[PDB]
Amino acid sequence: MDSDTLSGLLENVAKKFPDRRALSVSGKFNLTHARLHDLIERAASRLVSDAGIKPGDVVALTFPNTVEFVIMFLAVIRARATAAPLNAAYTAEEFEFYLSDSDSKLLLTSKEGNAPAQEAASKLKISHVTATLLDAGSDLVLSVADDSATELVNHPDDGALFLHTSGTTSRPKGVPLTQLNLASSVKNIKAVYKLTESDSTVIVLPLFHVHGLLAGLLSSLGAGAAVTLPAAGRFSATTFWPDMKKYNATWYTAVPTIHQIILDRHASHPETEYPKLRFIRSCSASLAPVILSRLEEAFGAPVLEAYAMTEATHLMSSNPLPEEGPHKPGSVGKPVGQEMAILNEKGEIQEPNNKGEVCIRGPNVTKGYKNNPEANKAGFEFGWFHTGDIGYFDTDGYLHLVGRIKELINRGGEKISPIEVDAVLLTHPDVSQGVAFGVPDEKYGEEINCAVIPREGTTVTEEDIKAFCKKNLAAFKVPKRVFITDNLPKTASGKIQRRIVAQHFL
Ligand SMILES: Nc1ncnc2c1ncn2[C@@H]1O[C@H](COP(=O)(O)OP(=O)(O)OP(=O)(O)O)[C@@H](O)[C@H]1O
Ligand SMILES: [Mg+2]
């Protein structure tokens, strides 16, 4: 059943599991694998014959998390074109930038449209086409005027997905990913979680970032499993568990800020009963051990943390299923389907429990950034990609992350991990959210500060937080200032970015 292209893999899946459920929209649609496969083939045929899409063309997509986004994403790639999913919330100026930078030749949206994206596409003279799924008796309707897919051969080295990085420690970089990149990551994710055709999940993350796209959507479809999209095209804490129950979910994946919202909802409105999940997954930012504990206690499933990035087509490492090995709080587990090494600044491989930069090598990894010869010369050596993250392997081969090189706090020669300190802040009884960050300091060069959101109806002082930290951290790691606030900025992906927080409180 496996294949070295995503389109090939999905074809094998449809043939093996044609009448199993593939894709539901809560309360509305329920597509089987054969039906979805044919909707995709027919749409790809229309893109080639009627929209003039040629191999290597880039097609931009901007949708909520909807059935048309799924169908058109896979139709674009099937037609040997490259999909460039874009955040629907961008301004017209942002859209103009990303449409130009990706070399998009076509913009797809829903029939309702997206006014800023349409404004940008018109200014750049890029065609705009809408996509609508009506009923089970009809093909997907495309707004382009009136077979041709069948002939098409998908090559592992064809471009398939073009994304930018989240912009956390830099200006977002452009990342081209191939059919082969996608197929490799789908095989890795399916393998480490043993996804099979009886699995089922609800998507709670944006499908324009690789976490929800690769793990939630594509790896499920690649196992013959099922995916449910929320009725309103985005995560809702109120409909999450009803959807998970109704559509027989067996797992879900989310980022720590979304897991915290789900936990809050469990505290204020517990369900009378929860489904028994095989596992709950967390990725994209560190999962504090206390959040892991809270999730296992609330929902009774093992919580497996993974480590991933856009340049790796998502998954690099994960804690294993309990039947294969332990999962370690504070750890992102073992490499899956790729090589990984910890290197010092001279490129020497480090022994266990010695820190260094995490480097990876594998068929899931991008061949290189688009139009950035310098980032490529800096980031790649003999096939290995330098992640920019500092970590170490313990003697079981489990990876422990210390943090991004650019985020470590250098206080008078001692480096502080903001990950470590965050994990402590979240254990304070009255802290609902917390983030540590570096700031300039005239005596030590850099100092650590933090910001916390108190739990509703509690009052928290800087001095309480600091005292609590002093009981749980070496003194040099204790935030010198604690900012108390009602809200922290997070990305569309759900990451709190420390540089933004820092600037905001200074
Ligand atoms: N489980 C985890 N724990 C800690 N950090 C993680 C984890 N999973 C992913 N990360 C972090 O997320 C990064 C990947 O994020 P993504 O590819 O979305 O872009 P970004 O690094 O946030 O943005 P930019 O590349 O523009 O700086 C990893 O390099 C690592 O720093
Ligand atoms: Mg990055």
- Per DSSP, the residues of 402-471 read EEEGGG-EEETTEEE-HHHHHHHHTTSTTEEEEEEEEEEETTTEEEEEEEEEEPTT----HHHHHHHHHT
Q: What's the Cα-to-Cα distance from 156 to each of 7, 140, 161, 294, rounded to whole Å?
A: 10, 27, 12, 42
**What spacing in Å lies between the alpha carbon of 312 and ligand 2's midpoint?**
10
Q: Is 171 left (phi over 0), alpha (psi -120 to 50) or beta?
A: beta
Strand partners for 333: 399
**Structural contact between residues 493 and 255, judged by C-beta atoms closer than 8 angstroms:** yes
Pocket test for ligand 1, best of 177, 209, 284, 491 (most atoms within 8 A of CB): 284
Q: Is 370 left (phi over 0), alpha (psi -120 to 50) or beta?
A: beta
Token pair for residue 287?
Answer: 């999962």
Q: Is 99 left (phi over 0), alpha (psi -120 to 50) or beta?
A: alpha
How far is residue 261 CA from its own chain's centroid? 17
- Is 417 close to ligand 1, i.e. is its CB under 6 Å away? no
- Is 427 close to ligand 1, i.e. is its CB under 6 Å away? no
How far is residue 230 CA from its own chain's centroid? 17
Q: Is 388 left (phi over 0), alpha (psi -120 to 50) or beta?
A: left
Token pair for residue 98?
Answer: 């990303």
Closest to 495 measured CA to CA, from 46, 168, 81, 52: 168
- Is 175 close to ligand 1, i.e. is its CB under 6 Å away? no
CA pair distance 18, 36, nearest whole angstrom:
9
What is residue 490's DSSP assignment?
B
Atom of ligand 1 nearest to the CA of 419: 4
**Structural contact between residues 132 and 110, judged by C-beta atoms closer than 8 angstroms:** yes
Token pair for residue 134?
Answer: 């009506």
- Is 217 close to ligand 1, i.e. is its CB under 6 Å away? no
Token pair for residue 305?
Answer: 């943390």
Cα atoms in the 13 Å half-sphere on the side-chain side of 11: 15
**Structural contact between residues 419 and 401, judged by C-beta atoms closer than 8 angstroms:** yes
CA pair distance 380, 388, nearest whole angstrom:
12
Beta-carbon contacts of residue 352 (< 8 Å; ≥ 6 apart): 392, 393, 394, 395
Query: Which residue's CA is minimally distant from atom 14 of ligand 1?
Result: 309
- Is 387 close to ligand 1, i.e. is its CB under 6 Å away? yes
Query: What amino acid occupies position 420?
Result: E
- Is 170 close to ligand 1, i.e. is its CB under 6 Å away? yes
Strand partners for 438: 448
CA angle centred on 294, ends 480 and 495, rounded to 5°: 55
Q: Which ligand is nearest to the CA of 497?
A: 1
- Is 499 close to ligand 1, i.e. is its CB under 6 Å away? no
Pocket test for ligand 1, best of 98, 162, 163, 166 (most atoms within 8 A of CB): 166
Cα atoms in the 13 Å half-sphere on the side-chain side of 9: 25
**495 labeled binding residue:** yes
Residue 167's Cβ-count burial label (10 Å; 0-12, 13-18, 19+) is middle
> By what method was this entry solved?
X-ray
**Structural contact between residues 193 and 251, judged by C-beta atoms closer than 8 angstroms:** yes
Residue 270's Cβ-count burial label (10 Å; 0-12, 13-18, 19+) is exposed
| Burial call 21-40: b when 16+ CB within 10 Å, e when fewer | bbbbbbeebebbbbbbbebb
**361 labeled binding residue:** no
Q: Is the dihedral of CA 77, 79, 84, 90 positive or negative?
A: negative
Q: At what angle do helices 6-16 and 67-78 cross, to 10 degrees?
A: 120
Query: What amino acid occupies position 267?
Result: A
Alpha helix (H) residue ranges in 23-91:
33-50, 67-78
What is residue 375's DSSP assignment?
H
Pocket test for ligand 1, best of 309, 311, 332 (most atoms within 8 A of CB): 309
Token pair for residue 97?
Answer: 């930038």
CA angle centred on 397, ends 350 and 364, rounded to 5°: 90
Q: Is 410 left (phi over 0), alpha (psi -120 to 50) or beta?
A: beta
Sheet hosting strand 21-25, strand order edge to edge: 29-32, 21-25, 226-229, 200-202
Strand partners for 159: 178
**Structural contact between residues 484 and 452, judged by C-beta atoms closer than 8 angstroms:** yes
Q: Is 238 left (phi over 0), alpha (psi -120 to 50) or beta?
A: alpha
| Burial call 48-61: b when 16+ CB within 10 Å, e when fewer | beebebeeebbbbb
